[PDB]
Amino acid sequence: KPLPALKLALEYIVPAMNKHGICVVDDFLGKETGQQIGDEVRALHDTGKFTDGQDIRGDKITWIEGKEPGCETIGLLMSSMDDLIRHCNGKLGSYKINGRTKAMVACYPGNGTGYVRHVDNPNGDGRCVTCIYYLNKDWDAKVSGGILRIFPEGKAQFADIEPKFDRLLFFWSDRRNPHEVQPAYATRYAITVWYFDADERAAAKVKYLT
Amino acid sequence: XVWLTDTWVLSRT
Ligand SMILES: O=C(O)CNC(=O)C(=O)O
Ligand SMILES: [Mn+2]
């Protein structure tokens, strides 16, 4: 009953991303797996593993590789994301996607926290696609806010993305999609991975010193 | 199983 990943990628994600630069897949993993991911994320939060995401942003974050004890289902989510990008078979724009970040697990801990309008990759750092999975059971922005508002370039209207349970979102990471997280009034969780274009990443426009 | 192509949302199920 769920669309197979290969068909989902080729028949929907590829055409939607090339047409709109934004693509939402609802009901990505199903209730049982979405809930397990929630349990794993709440466990990370409750045992104090998050740090300040940073005013520009009021989220708390941690990075997950996917093999850590207690993170097996998050690892399943990450491999499911990777499978979708592989099935896209180079058809997302002209990018040569060969890598990605670890998963960024993020919490906006209610109390009106959010993220001011920003571009993920404004300086050519190689990130081409942002992939976010939301895991907020019964989230309703009418009560709890927390909408992701995207302002796609060339378009007059904005795109509001509620951080709905089991919702997968893709969007170009570059200046085409400035976006903001509106104030959140309940605990809002999301997991993001960014995918890299091989060539842009190799141009080393950003040097990280330590 | 229906994508309204002027939109950017689809349910997988
Ligand atoms: O959580 C969201 O919906 C969006 N998050 C971000 O814009 C980010 O962390 O860069
Ligand atoms: Mn962002």
Author numbering:
A (entry chain A): 186 to 239, 250 to 405
B (entry chain B): 1 to 13
What do the paper's sentences say?
The degradation of HIFα subunits is promoted by post-translational hydroxylation of prolyl-residues located in its N/C-terminal oxygen dependent degradation domains (NODD and CODD). These dioxygen-sensitive reactions are catalysed by 2-oxoglutarate (2OG) and Fe(II) dependent prolyl hydroxylases (PHD 1–3 in humans). The human PHDs catalyse hydroxylation of prolyl-residues within the N/C terminal ODDs of HIF-1/2/3α and are negative regulators of the transcriptionally regulated hypoxic response.
We successfully crystallized cPHD2 in the presence of a 14-residue NCCP (3C), obtained in a RaPID with five rounds of screening. Multiple crystals were obtained in the presence of 3C and active site binding inhibitors, such as NOG (N-oxalylglycine, a close 2OG analogue) and FG2216, in the hexagonal P65 crystal form. Consistent with the reported NMR studies, we obtained multiple crystal structures revealing that 3C binds in the region of cPHD2 immediately to the N-terminal side of the core distorted double stranded β-helix (DSBH) fold of PHD2. Interestingly, within the crystal lattice, 3C ‘slots’ into a tight groove between the non-DSBH β1 of one cPHD2 molecule and the C-terminal α4 (that is also involved in the P63 crystal packing) of a neighbouring symmetry related cPHD2 molecule. Binding of 3C at the interface of two symmetry related PHD2 monomers likely promotes contacts productive for crystallization in part via projecting part of the C-terminal helix α4 (aa 400–404) away from the active site, in a manner that maintains interactions with substrates that are required for catalysis. In the cPHD2.3C complex structures, 3C adopts a rectangular fold comprising two (almost) planar distorted β-strands connected by two type II beta turns with DY1, D6, W8 and T13 at its four corners; most of the side chains do not protrude extensively. 3C forms extensive backbone-to-backbone interactions with cPHD2 β1 (aa 204–214) and three residues located at the N-terminus (187–189) within the same cPHD2 monomer and six residues (399–404) located at the C-terminus of a symmetry related cPHD2 molecule. In addition, there are backbone to side-chain polar interactions between L188PHD2 and F213PHD2 with R123C, and A399PHD2 with T53C, as well as side-chain to side-chain electrostatic/H-bond interactions of D212PHD2 with T133C and S113C, and of K186PHD2 with YD13C. Although the 3C interacting PHD2 residues are well-conserved in all three human PHDs, they are different in other 2OG-oxygenases including the ribosomal prolyl hydroxylase (OGFOD1, Z = 17.4), nucleic acid demethylases (e.g., FTO, Z = 14.4), phytanoyl-CoA dioxygenase (PAHX, Z = 13.3)38 and factor inhibiting HIF (FIH, Z = 10.8), providing a structural basis for the high selectivity of 3C and related NCCPs for the PHDs.
